[PDB]
Structure 1
Amino acid sequence: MSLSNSSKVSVLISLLEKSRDLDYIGEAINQLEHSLQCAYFAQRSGADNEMVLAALLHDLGHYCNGGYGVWQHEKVGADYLRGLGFSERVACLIEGHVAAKRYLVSSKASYLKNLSDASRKTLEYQGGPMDEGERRLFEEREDFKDCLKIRAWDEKGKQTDLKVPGPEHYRKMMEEHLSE
């Protein structure tokens, strides 16, 4: 917090590593594997560094302090990163990922089938599928399309076999983000 950029990043990596002991409900992976797969799909797609970091860190709220997770984890994680010095763009992509879930479900009921048990279970209490009115305001966000991409990777980052790079692969990216 008053730390150097390098030490702030070491704290984040330590929190990510600790998340391996947190289960991801409904699939044969843990929270660390989930985070890493999301970042991997982002980077492999050719996404910019802010998108990759948002994907890596979208669930940070679950473990920067549950079974299904932390209430309002999307805000907890975004605000923590705001405090550390991350850009508003990254913070908003992360904060928006629950609304993105509600939007996608409201648009096509078929999207429900894509949801893990964890994502499906929290949805009711997060407001369920969006209103027509809610959809309109979400679509008005400047990062509307990017929020949806973050959520697509979120739904995809639950593969059983998949080997992906660990947190150190993103250290330099995070340090540069903070400097920039």
Structure 2
Amino acid sequence: SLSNSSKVSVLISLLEKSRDLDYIGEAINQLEHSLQCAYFAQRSGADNEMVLAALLHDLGHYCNDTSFEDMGGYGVWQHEKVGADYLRGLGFSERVACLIEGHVAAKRYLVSSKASYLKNLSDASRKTLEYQGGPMDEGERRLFEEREDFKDCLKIRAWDEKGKQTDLKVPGPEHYRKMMEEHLSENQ
């Protein structure tokens, strides 16, 4: 496969492309959203795996045919699975992939824990919830609470909902190049 450096160049290219996707309407695009999330993680003192999970959590959304092929999304569709599986294939840690794959479940948990959380959801997050099994029931919450990455998943999703700031200067994707290169190296 590609070197770690070039795998990261590919990821940065995919991140830059995601600027073309709306996130909070046209006002906040997906790249801006992802960069804010990475920043919240970083400046909260989170570890590199958390920062990378935050940066990359939405990479799996369908952007165009070529990028979706690059990531292998066809037949899978769910962005949390598409992104997590792509990163696993590149050699990211299981921890990073699980934080990403879990961010839909995290929303279902939060809504069930505090109905008021529903009010924090974007139009899209509110409607996708209808097709993700709705809020978790008690038994589902128990299982989720058992996960070794339970609280970390909740943090990722709290940052996710927060990643809609209109006037926030945060570093771009290149800022995280070394962090991604080091992660790939550590995980060989």
Give the Cα–Cα distance (whole angstroms) in 2 for the partners of residues 69 and 149 of structure 1.
29
CA distance in 2, matches of 1:157, 1:140: 27
**Pairwise CA distance, 1:28:** 2.0
CA contact (8 A) 2:18 2:59 kept: no
Partner of 1:91: 97
Q: Please, which moves more after superposition, 60-69 or 137-146?
A: 60-69
The verdict on how the C-alpha distance between 1:70 and 1:59 changes in structure 2, with shifts beyond 3 A counting, is farther
Task: Quote the Cα distance in structure 2 between the aligned partners of 1:18 and 1:28.
Answer: 16
Aligned residues with identical type, % of pairs: 100
Question: Deviation of residue 137 (structure 1)?
Answer: 0.5
CA contact (8 A) 2:19 2:32 kept: yes
- What are the Cα deviations for residues 78-122 of structure 1, in whole angstroms up to 9, with x where unaligned? 000000000000000000000000000011100001111121121
Tell me if structure 2 keeps the 8 A contact 1:20–1:33.
yes
- Residues 1:79 and 1:105: Cα distance change in structure 2 (over 3 Å): same
Shift of 1:44: 0.5
User: After alignment, is 78-87 or 65-74 more displaced?
Assistant: 65-74
Q: TM-score, normalised by structure 1?
A: 0.94
Change (3 A) 1:81 1:101: same
Contact 2:60 2:73 in 1 (8 A): no
Measure, in 2, the Cα distance between the counterparts of 1:158 and 1:63: 20
Number of equivalent positions: 179
CA RMSD for the aligned pairs?
2.6
Aligned to 2:22, the other structure's residue is in SS state coil
